[PDB]
């Protein structure tokens, strides 16, 4: 029973820990986070849960998402001052839907998209991402190309891109900067696993492909 695949794959492993900075990034920033981070939901960024999910080909599951956000003071301020409250509008962007580019990026209203509301002074955000892919399971691999052009990337599904889990500061900027470490936890429930693969032996170098060295 403990060795059931539902019991096996439902471990809340950290797959994206983004310590994204909360400051007036509109003042002088070039490429970095503008009080928001756009993370495409792929379960392959951290190799523990990745090698847990390279065990199988096809993995249809209801992907429970748990977002634990901890606000720490910035090193520029170098003062504690107490932890201020900060509600976060955590949007999931589905495949095909547009992704935001700013903190006030006009997509955060989410007329079609689904966003949740929570605070930092509240236990972590537990919702359940629906199994949304066009195919009947999550092909974590793709022996093929996403597009019909030759330069399409190998290994990427045009259907298993889960979305973009975009988390911002809906509140305005503070004069005191704060590094918000957002930790993303995947609890895949309702595991429907198919066709087991060997566990990976050689270390990874690229998240997208399965190259070896």
């Amino acid at each position: 029973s403990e060795t059931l695949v539902e019991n096996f794959l439902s471990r809340a492993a950290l797959v994206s820990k983004r310590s994204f900075e909360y400051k007036n990034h509109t003042s002088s920033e070039a490429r970095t986070d503008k009080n928001f981070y756009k993370w495409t939901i792929n379960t392959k960024s951290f190799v523990q849960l990745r090698r847990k999910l390279e065990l199988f080909t096809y993995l249809r599951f209801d992907a429970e998402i748990t977002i634990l956000t901890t606000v720490a003071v910035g090193s520029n301020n170098s003062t504690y001052m107490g932890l201020p409250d900060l509600t976060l509008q955590a949007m999931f962007v589905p495949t095909g839907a547009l992704t935001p580019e700013k903190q006030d990026s006009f997509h955060w209203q989410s007329g079609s998209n689904a966003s949740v509301f929570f605070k930092v002074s509240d236990p972590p955000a537990r919702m359940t991402i629906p199994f949304m892919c066009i195919n009947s399971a999550y092909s974590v691999f793709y022996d093929g190309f996403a597009g019909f052009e030759k330069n399409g990337l190998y290994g990427i599904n045009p259907a298993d891109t889960i979305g973009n889990l975009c988390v911002r500061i809906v509140n305005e900027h503070q004069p005191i900067g704060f590094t918000v470490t957002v930790r993303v936890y995947m609890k895949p429930k309702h595991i429907k696993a198919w066709a087991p693969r060997p566990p990976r032996t050689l270390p990874y170098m690229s998240i997208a492909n399965a190259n070896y060295k």
Binding site: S136, F141, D143, A195, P196, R200
Partner: protein, 203 residues
Amino acid sequence: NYCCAYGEWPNYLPDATDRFYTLKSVKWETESTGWWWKLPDALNNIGMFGQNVQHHYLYRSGFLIHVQCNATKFHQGALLVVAIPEHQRGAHNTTTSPGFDDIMKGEEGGTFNHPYVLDDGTSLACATIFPHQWINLRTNNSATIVLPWMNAAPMDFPLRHNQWTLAIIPVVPLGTRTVSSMVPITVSIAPMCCEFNGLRHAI
């Protein structure tokens, strides 16, 4: 005896091209690393099924893999015939995704670069979890493998997706003390329970 994948017979989709498309048989040597044929890319350009690949935007097909190792009884060697479900390959020591010519090898199929890790970061030592038989020339001269529909999508494009991937690997190299002699790997694939919809232009 056949070794149908995970104990189920292939069939049509729930609510002509069954000719055994024998490939050009590869020379098995002592130094032969192994040969992989991605399906239907091994049959994308040959036969009426190969024309159905271009003529249809979507497809579904099972495959009756039959590998033949015609050998003397004095010959030595076992090949892992493994039909990998969805073999996403990798390249050694590079972070780059492998391109068209390293995967879309056509009817001839690709050789194995580092087959011990199965050229994908896994281990071939565990690759007997797969649809798999043995062509150990002591007892088995010809093996066969039955492959159902293996895709999360019910019915998809052939020309930009490989569902199965045959991989014939010499886990034990050839032995006849004339280094190697004859022994071809006659890989014959019959697309069984084939179905094609989406009548469009021949891509």
